[PDB]
Design a protein around this ligand. Sequence first.
Ligand SMILES: [Mg+2]
Ligand SMILES: [Mg+2]
Lengths: 503, 503, 447, 445
Amino acid sequence: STVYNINLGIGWASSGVEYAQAYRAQILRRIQQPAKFIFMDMILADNIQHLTENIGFLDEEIIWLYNYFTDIKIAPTTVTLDQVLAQVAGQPERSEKEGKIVRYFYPQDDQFITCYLRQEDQDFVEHVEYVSRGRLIRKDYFSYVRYASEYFAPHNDAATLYQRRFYHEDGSVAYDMLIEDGQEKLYRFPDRIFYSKAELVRYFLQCLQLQADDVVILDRETGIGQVVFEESQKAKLGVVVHAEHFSENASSDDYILWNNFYDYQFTNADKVDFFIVATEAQKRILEQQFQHYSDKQPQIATIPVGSLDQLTYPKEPRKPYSMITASRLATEKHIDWLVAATVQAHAQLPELTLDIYGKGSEEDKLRRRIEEAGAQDYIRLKGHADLSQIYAGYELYLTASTSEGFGLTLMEAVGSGLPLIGFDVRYGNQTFIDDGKNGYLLPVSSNHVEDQIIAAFVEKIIALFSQGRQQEMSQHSYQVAENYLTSRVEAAWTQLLKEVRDD
Amino acid sequence: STVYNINLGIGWASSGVEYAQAYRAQILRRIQQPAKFIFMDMILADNIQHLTENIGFLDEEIIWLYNYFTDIKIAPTTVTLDQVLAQVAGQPERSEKEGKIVRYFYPQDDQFITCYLRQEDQDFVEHVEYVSRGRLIRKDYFSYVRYASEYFAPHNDAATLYQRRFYHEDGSVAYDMLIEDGQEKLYRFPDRIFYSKAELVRYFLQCLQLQADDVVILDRETGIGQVVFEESQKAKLGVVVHAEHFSENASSDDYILWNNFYDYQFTNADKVDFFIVATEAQKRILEQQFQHYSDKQPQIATIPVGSLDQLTYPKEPRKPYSMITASRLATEKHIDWLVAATVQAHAQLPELTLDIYGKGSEEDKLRRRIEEAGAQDYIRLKGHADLSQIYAGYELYLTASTSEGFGLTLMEAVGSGLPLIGFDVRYGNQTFIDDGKNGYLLPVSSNHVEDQIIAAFVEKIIALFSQGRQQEMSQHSYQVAENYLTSRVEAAWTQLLKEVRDD
Amino acid sequence: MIQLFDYYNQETQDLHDSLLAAGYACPTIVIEANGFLPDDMISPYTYFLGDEEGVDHPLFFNQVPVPPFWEITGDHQVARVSDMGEERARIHYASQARGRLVKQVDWLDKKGQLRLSERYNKQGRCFAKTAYKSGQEAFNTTYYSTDGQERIVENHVTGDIILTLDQEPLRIFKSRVDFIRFFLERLDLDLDHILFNSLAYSFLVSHSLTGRAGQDILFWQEPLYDELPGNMQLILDNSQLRTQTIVIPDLATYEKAMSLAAADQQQKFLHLGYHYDFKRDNYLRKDALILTHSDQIEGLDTLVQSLPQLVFRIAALTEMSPKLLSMLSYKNVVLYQNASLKQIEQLYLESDIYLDINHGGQVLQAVRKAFENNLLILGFEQTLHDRHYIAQQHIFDSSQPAQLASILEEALCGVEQMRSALQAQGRHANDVPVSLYQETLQSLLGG
Amino acid sequence: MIQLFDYYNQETQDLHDSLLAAGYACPTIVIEANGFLPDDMISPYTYFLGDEEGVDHPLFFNQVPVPPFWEITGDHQVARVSDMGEERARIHYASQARGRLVKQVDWLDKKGQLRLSERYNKQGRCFAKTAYKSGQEAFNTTYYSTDGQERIVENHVTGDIILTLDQEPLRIFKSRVDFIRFFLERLDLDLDHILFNSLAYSFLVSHSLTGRAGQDILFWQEPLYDELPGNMQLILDNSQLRTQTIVIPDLATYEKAMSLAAADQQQKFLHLGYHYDFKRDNYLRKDALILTHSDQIEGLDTLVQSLPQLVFRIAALTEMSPKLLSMLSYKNVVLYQNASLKQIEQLYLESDIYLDINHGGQVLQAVRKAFENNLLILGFEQTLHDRHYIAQQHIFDSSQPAQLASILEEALCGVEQMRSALQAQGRHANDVPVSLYQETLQSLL
Ligand SMILES: [Mg+2]
Ligand SMILES: [Mg+2]
């Protein structure tokens, strides 16, 4: 009995879904629940295993689609330039090393083999290209052996991919594919032929031979949603909702517009055994929009995306009168409202200061005005820091997010102890805050009116800085934090697999 | 649990496979093994009920592919001229009647309707064509309701079928199909759409919801072979061999050439649970050709196509030295020789007399050849007759056909205690003629040269007309025939289906 | 009295709504098989099918019944049905204020050609399927009852219409005219006068009724060119036909009509307009409202810096590319993204101009809704139609006088500076008082 | 010495079969990647993949491995693979007497365009897959060892042959000419004289080594027209290229091989013919053989009334139309259909004149088979190829009159005249005794 998690792709810099998975893998270990993680995309740029391992996936949890048909195992790239040239013939006259691209010329007839290396300093070659008379004709990819290669030809005097072959440990061909218009249009096995990736994915999941007690969990639907649904009917199927499932600005009393990434799953929800939402705020309403609009009653389960390991009680003096914002910085941020409402709150409050961690787009315009504004030296500036322990050295946290599906920095914040102010908006600020108790939730009008909130920020800022509340609602801010930490996650994650299979 | 027999077509002149199926129905009734007989062809020119009842099926036994999706019963055509006219608006000025076609004219609107009857001496109507301004725009098909309609439109001034529609008892649309070049290219259901007849037959077989102990018996393969195989795996599949199953002249010890109508079933025999051959002679031949050419050992079972309810003994006349042949006279059955063989045995014996029955194409030429070589009409010819009562009147049956897969004539001939003389060839002759016991098997060369055949026939006509042995062979027909009684074939069927249902 | 319109669209609605204002409420017949008809009207194709009247709850794009597991997707202009990613149907949107309502779903074969068109009404039911032969030529169209029975089979090659209603015998009609005629007699509609909007079947019903006595009016709404339509002649040349009157609400063509009609021959052309029901007066305030699908609005940067006093509100129900999200750098601009219908109404209150400046397709009859709300519309020659509602004086070249809007626009400086301008677009749309119908008609409309 | 043969066909088999009669048997190499090669020939594409040599047991058409439940159908002409009724693959037959043997299988996409060609050998294995790009233009061909490894991958756009042997380093050749030479020097065959039959890659392997010891020849067969290839003109002009000696076996291809070229070009190219191994003499049995794929055999109605002397044996491997079977009642005609391979060998042994009178497809190299047994061949101006083996005193008119067609060889009753017709037959086929081979080549070693 296994739990197969399905996702499309992965990368060095990757985003909430992948981490919600990688995280989910670690709990599922601790329960002894066996689980694999399937990835459907074509990932040759990196070796697949490097990306999986970085995010924290064990190699015995990784099913790569195109690998699964071979005896080769998910592995780090151990193949060396030494080994690579044992396979090439002749002798290299002159090397050349620019960063990670190192190549050796065989000018007699005009050849060279260009190598691309895992790390600039090491010798483990990730892939090699064979160029003869100026044209790429072959490219091989390595882990502990060549697990695949690519064949090329000139077209429009541009190197063009026509074929990609996959091999077993011994170099016998497992299967190959044709490439036209940058799409995979044919797959040829010894006993099979397939004309579309959609029908390849069906074969793969039939080869898994899913059975009644296995659980398939679909984290991304694009291109695979229909085939996963059909082949998962024998097993238990479930769909997880990352971010927000509908659009209220396009909905009405009789007609709701789902987000285009969950529409198929919601439309077909009678094929799904259970749904997974980040917050029970989402289980709350999506349960009723299933009731109101579609009259369907699919089982929905709340399982947070992160966890707290330990309630973090600081042993240092609480620094009175300070501030912070940690978010991934863009326009959607809207902390020019956090910038201004600090100036507009600095008049009445002693020596207060905020730190802005996270950097990116728009960082230019926040520096633009924070200097010409009143508190220039008493609001912070510089970027990335790992705040894993530093939250507790603070007083309050500031979020102008119009949307958060699950706040992760918020997740850390309440465990670390800060009171919390944010708009009353789905779903994170609503599941992490009460407007007595932890904090204040600012109701927001339907449109951007700047001085609306900038004054409406200051008034709940000061109601807490006034005694006795600031530490009052901090210290029971944790009695809710006691549900979002690991032992409770492993409870419900555990909890969920059993009532799924008693069905 | 039920037995599903799958065939393609049926007709008035229907024979071979269909008469075999009809008696399998009669057998399966007494055994109380419930059966359905499936027909995949699109049959509108006659009510399919009229054809099935003509051959002996019960309407409760018939499954027609295109009717199956409706709620209308298989029923004879009872809709009448009066009822047809009642539902066309207006009153016709004039009527026309030509054979079974009866036209009603409505000159006021420039439209007429053409009714096609069942019998000319009754008022029942199978079809009605609606012609508007000399154009066929619609046609209906009647059993006890309108169960189907076709819609036309002129192309190169030829009425052309573009669409066919099937209805429920209440007149509502069950589904319709698009016709392009005599091909049905699109099927439209409310909840389905199908782009080929193969995929439609799949949905049909799926809607049957075959259980594990259901038995699917394949009588004909062409066009449905693979789909019947894919969908019958969850049940017990079987394949009946009706003719000689291989081309011997085109084979060798190295390579065997199957009959193309069985090639798919044989090649895929690993997917077949059991085969069925007409004669044990054929069971053994095909059994080894399997072993030799592709090592497999599929279960092959022997059921006769026919049987004998009882053994008929004569009324105590037998015309001294009289013979019989009943065949559908054609090129293949070569009665030319034996009209010419006994003309020399009437020389060596005084009272020798024979006569030919059967009817078909090509021997308008026979009646010419009868006495135009000077033979005389002690060789009588008779036309069509039902012969159950008539075989025991003679002392010897005779056959010149070069191939028979089983034979129905020989079984009844032997059932009347008539020895046989025919070639030594697969199968029926080798099955019903035990050489020397009830008759003589004449070797024939791999090529047909003529004059030796006639001589080898007459030589064993006096060795079978001089003497003491004939009633001392007419014994052995009664000897071989008791293996062929109805009670013993009911046994083999009950046992075969009991065997099949243990795997 | 009856109004018989070939098609249902806004031009026939305006004509219909005007006549109703002037006291003309008769029964109204649309020949077209349109599934979303105002309860005001009926059609012979939809009339006998058994649908419940006064129900508006159409299908939503993802409620199209499909084979099990087949995938429905769609954007704001269209939708799709797929089997394992392969295109199967196109779902077409009924053009309504509410988006993504199912009008017609077009089924394809595996080579992608059109085969069936299954048609939906305002009640969400599929009342018709059209079948296509080889060239994607229409073979026929079947119209079903709510029980799924054939009520009407119209052969598109021969024209023959097979009408079978419930518990009645089968009737074949040789032509569309003969079918409409059955419908008029069947409903016992009073034929004093037939007011119709085109020279298609809605006319040929009149041309073929000459035996019966009455006179009918044709409101000619289409453009005119070098000649008259051949048939617009035989109403002038023949003196016996039931229709001797040609009403032409658009002036500009009425002149082109009088131009091509002979001196004897211009006695038959009456000219009129439409009576619009406007929702509120202007008030000459500070605010812009533009509805765009995506960028960029031609010359927004130009106009916005040059007139900083004017509020600029731009909306879409899509999301906005940072190319335009760049322009809200100005405090002069206000931008609404993924705009609600509720929000889009509010902006039509708070803005008294509509600049038709955007590129691409039109956003929910925005030019019309502006006109109904008495917003003064201007733009450049690439306008999202309608051209009906924008006056020549107000239109511009494609940024040839890139901004010459702004201070021709700025002629918003007070009350009769504008009141001019909205009679400019008011005239161009051929606005007339309800009285002008009463005068122009009862010289004809008797019986 | 070697035999470097561009393509395998019978023009090469006859040329190979005669040199061994003259004692020239040497290792022979065909460049073509041909999976059906006689046990004494090899190919560089075929050798390193490791099939047991000597095994001839190809695949029967219905043995092509196909996805589960897919149906295989076919006739004597061709087979196909179908999924739920729609064409997927074509199955092409190896051209042998034994029918329906799988030389290659062409898989198609759902729109019907050609994508793969899976090529098959005599031993019953698929040793090569050719992949195609959009234009139905060939992209690459992979040749596989029997255990599934890649051995050769040839790029058809760049010509680059990448050759990876077992345990060996991977090499990249730039052309087939480079590939053939590696093959030659690898088995270290003795390059004295290379005997090659065309101006394609084989000759580019001789013109390749001109600087190296040894001297070789061309044997030119392909028919000639208005003027010479530029490529035999390369070697008539050049003296020191390694081939200077061109023979042409078919005398109708030679008289002209001079007519175009001067007398200086002329020391260079010899003349020969082929020495065929005939299996029996005539014996003038009065019997005729006709092997037809379908009727009607041109004017045979005319011959048979005119030749009651003549028995006409008409055989077809399929069934025939009553259109012909109507002729059986002509009592000098005998008919054989569903003709067995053995039965039809008997007829070749029982008849002495082969009429090539049938229309359309010929049967299992039937004209050649007649020529091999000293059957006298006469046919009409549809002279169904081979025209190789027909003396023109013998071809006749395309049934305008058929009267002269027979009184030609009705004229042969005794023993001398028959003879004279059959060398006429044998001379046009360029029959020479093994002696002339050793004479014209004894000069060169
Ligand atoms: Mg499907
Ligand atoms: Mg399949």
